[PDB]
Amino acid sequence: NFGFHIAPTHPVAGRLTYDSKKLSENILKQQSDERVFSRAQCCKAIHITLGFDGTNNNDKADGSSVSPSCSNVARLIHASIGSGDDINSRGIFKYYCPGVGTVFPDIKEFTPSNMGLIGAEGGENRINWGLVQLVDALFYTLLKSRLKLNDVQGLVEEMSTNWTVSTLTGGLLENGEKKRRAALEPKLKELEEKLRQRQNSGQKPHILAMRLYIYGFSRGAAEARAFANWLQELTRVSDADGRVEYRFAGLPISIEFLGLFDTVAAVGLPFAAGHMDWADDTMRLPDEALPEDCSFLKRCVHLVSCHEQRASFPLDSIRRRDMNGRRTGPSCYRKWTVEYAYPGVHSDVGGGYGVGNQGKAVGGSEFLLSQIALQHMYAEAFEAGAPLQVPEWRVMVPKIEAEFSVSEELATRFNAWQAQAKAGPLEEVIRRETALITAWRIDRYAGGLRNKAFFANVPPDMPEAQQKAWEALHKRRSREYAAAQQLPPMSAAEQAEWDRNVALIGGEDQLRDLRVEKQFDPPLDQRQLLGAAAEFAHDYKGDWGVLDDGMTVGGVIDLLLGGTVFLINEEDEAEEYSQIHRDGSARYHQLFSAPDRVAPGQEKLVALFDEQVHDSRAPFTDYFRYRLVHFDNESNKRLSVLATAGRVVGVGVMLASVGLSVKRRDPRMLLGGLPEISAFDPLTGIALPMVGGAALDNLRAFTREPGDKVEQIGQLPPPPPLAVAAVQSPALQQVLLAQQTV
């Protein structure tokens, strides 16, 4: 099936129950290649699952403690077949890729991200690692060894585009397609040669095909989509007679299933983050050319969050216009691909919240909202032929079965949401769902959070002492790890502090709760929820204070992160605020009869928001803006390109980092010209040359086709490197001295 829909109702007994027929059919799909081959009077297909985990999700780290918090990607990998020499030799393999911002030794990423600052290169390296794993699967299939970690590392390095900005030459641009193909070619040829030998000598088993099952969440969903496109580019052979096929070292290859949770392709950063560089024009699902064996992608399911609103987490829908090179027709969904709207914020769909976080799912992962989407994804994948365990290698062990638990209370609450939700395109569903959670906040946050029922079961915040301790211990341990895998011993003072800290937790025993893989995240759900609630309350009351027609906002853009950055429109921001305020208030009156009094029949819904839906947020805040959504080249709101392709638009020099002061209209003053941008060097404070005029105004125009503008800008020549622009300016010469020193 296809198109956009509300989440389906969640069946009472769940989606993990099975029939011997159900199992028979999943098996039957897995063995289709063998059937075709055998009918022509032993053989095996290679079945490969690849899971790209989400932002700040790391399976090793997140699942190691007593309150584990594995994402749905990790859960699906745990329940996937492909572990061990035996099963691999039987042609089933599975691979897990940790999320960006977490340690990944295989790509030599030895430190976690700082305060959620995530560059594009981590994403690209994860995609390329993914590509390499396919090579590894074939390599093991034929030669009974696996690629050495040294060689994986080298391959990933060879395939990189090495983005940087230098004072001498400006942007360093490399062609990813060329580099990936070049790096993969020696191995693909070796493997093809081996397959030739085996075929001409009649060696068994006859290797038939490669069939892929791919799961992604968040930036890992972005990575999966780019992966699918880069793979299609690599394997599209499609010559001779003009028949089009996809082959990987001679072998037919297809993605049998692409399962995505809430795609976010944004650089890790009112500035609105745009795509990481590798994600531009690669979010669009693969288009097929002109049993079924012509197609590259057989099935894609994308489950998306309705209630996520963070500027840092824009959605990429899998909706897009047919496309020549030229786009024609309305935005719609490609055959065999479907997009479902789900309640909750980002990790309420992808998984990743632990029991009791923010007082949600207190006592039990079976109460965690993300368990519904998980089961749904499972069922879809199982239907599409995925090598999945069920409730001996084909069967889930207790731990993994419990990772898929859904309680009936959860099912009931979810279904109340599902039943009130109204059909429409994604934009309208977002408008209305934003209104619903706003309505809930008017009571639970604007009505004073401290005394609400659910807030009482938010776990108490970690004491300040333990917070500082854990942090400093983590800091030291992490630097040790990084310097090793790539430190001088602690000074007397540092060691005394270390031991104070080791004491502030109950001793050396506790040190193994340190996760080097992720940045330390202290339990501060009370302070954070109370803070957020005070924010929402302020925004919703609108007691602004003194206001000017204009506002000045500032920020440093780090062009080394390899991403695009936008500004949103003041008028549109004002109207969004107003529509949310109005819809929200109106819905409030159907949600509650009075303060703290839920209207009859609305209990299960209000309880879902109280005890299941998290608050990823925890002039005005993101509570009063709609989430940004991309549909390929198009977006749901107007955007102006502030920076892309490594330059700040209008800045007449290339620089690694650029300070900005932006003057624009205060949208608050619109409730009842393009922004003025000035740039400086952050290191010295010196003003950077600006250029302006009509052409530049056109490049900066607010449009709902930001992909088009990003492409257009990328086609234009860049500003000169700092060393060229400085030959005239003593000022820029100081800038250059500073930049050069770094």
Task: Please give the residue range of the domain that contains residue 482.
Answer: 464-513
**Same domain (yes/no): 337, 476:** no
b/e per residue 493-504 (b: at least 16 CB within 10 A): eeeebbeebbeb
Specify if 19 maps to a domain: yes
Give the residue from 268, 362, 374, 307 showing the smallest Cα distance to 627.
Answer: 307
Strand ranges in 128-269 using DSSP code E only, listed in sequence order? 165-166, 170-171, 206-217, 247-248, 251-261
Do 373 and 476 fall within a single domain? no
Other beta carbons within 10 angstroms of residue 158's beta carbon come to: 13
Q: How far apart are CA 661 and CA 676, in angstroms?
A: 8
Residues 320, 469: one domain? no
**Locus of tokens 């998306």:** 304
Which among 366, 363, 268 has a CA at the least distance from the CA of 313? 268
Are residue 81 and residue 226 in the same domain, yes or no?
yes
Q: For residue 115, give both structure tokens.
A: 């305060």
* Geometric angle at alpha carbon 67, from 63 and 73, rounded to 5°: 40
Instruction: Read off the tokens for 438.
Output: 């706003």
Scanning the structure block, which residue is given the tokens 């206001």?
547
Q: Please check whether residue 271 lies inside any domain of the structure.
A: yes
Prior bond to 205 cis, omega within 30? yes
Residue found by looking up tokens 């959860």 in the block = 410
Three-class DSSP category at 564: strand
**What is residue 463's DSSP assignment?**
P
Tokens of 365: 């992962």
- Which distant-in-sequence residues (6+ apart) come within 8 Å of 144 by Cβ? 89
Question: How many angstroms separate the CA atoms of 279 and 277, rounded?
Answer: 5
Phi-psi label, residue 644: left if phi above 0, alpha if psi -120 to 50, beta otherwise: beta
Token readout for 718 is 């860049």
Half-sphere exposure of 132 (CA within 13 A, CB side): 26
User: Do 48 and 166 belong to one domain?
Assistant: yes
Helix ranges, 486-618 (H): 492-504, 525-541, 570-591, 603-611
Rounded CA gap, 283 and 539, in Å? 34
Question: Measured between alpha carbons, how far is 703 from 713 in angstroms, rounded to an integer?
Answer: 14
Structure tokens at 350: 């992808």
Using alpha carbons, list the distances in angstroms from residue 329 to 38, 280, 322, 394. 43, 21, 6, 45
Q: Are 258 and 299 in contact (CB under 8 A)?
A: yes
Across-strand partners of 92?
Answer: 47
> For residues 155 and 150, what is the distance between their CA atoms, to the nearest angstrom?
9
Are 476 and 369 within one domain?
no
Alpha-carbon distance of 462 to 474, in angstroms, equals 16
CB neighbour list of residue 679: distance below 8 Å, 6 or more residues apart: 648, 650, 651, 658, 659, 660, 661, 687, 688, 690
Neighbouring CB atoms inside 10 A of 143's CB total 11
- Alpha-carbon distance of 338 to 344, in angstroms, equals 19
Q: What is the spatial distance between Cα 34 and Cα 51, in angstroms, rounded to a whole number?
A: 26
Same domain, yes or no: 134 and 265: yes
Q: In this structure, are 271 and 362 located in the same domain?
A: yes
DSSP type of residue 288: P
> For strand 247-248 and strand 251-261, is the pairing parallel, antiparallel, or unpaired?
antiparallel
Residue 564 sits at φ, ψ, to 5 deg, of: -95, 155
Task: Report the distance separating Cα 102 and Cα 40, nearest Å.
Answer: 49
Number of domains in the chain: 2
The DSSP call for residue 246 is B
Sign of the four-CA dihedral 380, 386, 392, 398: negative
Residue among 360, 223, 270 at smallest CA distance from 568: 270
Gaps after residue numbers in the chain (C–N over 2.5 angstroms): 41, 269, 290, 323, 391, 486, 618, 672
What is the distance between the alpha carbons of residues 235 and 253, in angstroms, rounded to a whole number? 8
Specify whether 165 is located in the same domain as 53.
yes
**35 within domain boundaries:** yes
State how far the Cα of 691 lies from the Cα of 687, in Å rounded to an integer. Answer: 13
C-beta atoms surrounding 735 within 10 Å: 25
- Integer angstrom CA distances of residue 630 from 21, 594, 637, 705: 40, 38, 9, 9
Give dist(CA 21, CA 638) in Å, integer: 51
Angle at alpha carbon of residue 462, lines to 460 and 468, rounded to 5°: 165
CA 562, 564, 567: angle at the middle one, nearest 5?
A: 145
The DSSP letter of residue 316 is E
Task: Indicate the resolution in Å.
Answer: 2.0
* 425 half-sphere exposure, CB direction, 13 A CA radius: 12
Cα R_g (the chain), whole angstroms: 26
Residues 7 and 340: beta-carbon distance below 8 Å: yes
C-alpha of 198 from chain center = 41
Asked whether residue 353 is domain-assigned, the answer is: yes
- The reply to whether 177 and 291 lie within a common domain is yes
Q: Within a domain: residue 565?
A: no
516 Cβ partners below 8 Å, 6+ apart? 103, 112, 474, 477, 478, 481
Residue 348 counted as domain residue = yes
Q: Are residues 254 and 362 in the same domain?
A: yes
Last residue of some domain: 346, 363, 394? 394
Q: Give a three-class secondary structure readout of 47-60.
A: EEEEEECCCCCCHH
483 and 357 inside one domain = no
Quote the CA–CA distance of 217 and 50 in Å, as a whole number. 12
Cα separation, 294 vs 694, whole angstroms: 47
Cα–Cα distance, 726 to 720 (Å, whole number): 9
Give the residue from 378, 394, 410 where a domain finishes: 394
Residue 210: closest CA among 254, 178, 167: 254
Q: What CA–CA distance (Å, rounded) separates 715 from 734?
A: 31
Residue 619 lies in a domain: no
Of 352, 368, 394, the residue that ends a domain is: 394
Token pair in block for residue 50: 């690849």
| CA proximity to 377, closest of 2, 3, 8, 4 | 8
Q: With respect to residue 626, please indicate whether it lies within any of the assigned structural domains.
A: no
Measured from the Cβ of residue 395, the count of other Cβ atoms closer than 10 Å reads 11
- Comparing CA positions, the residue from 202, 207, 197, 161 lying closest to residue 180 is 161
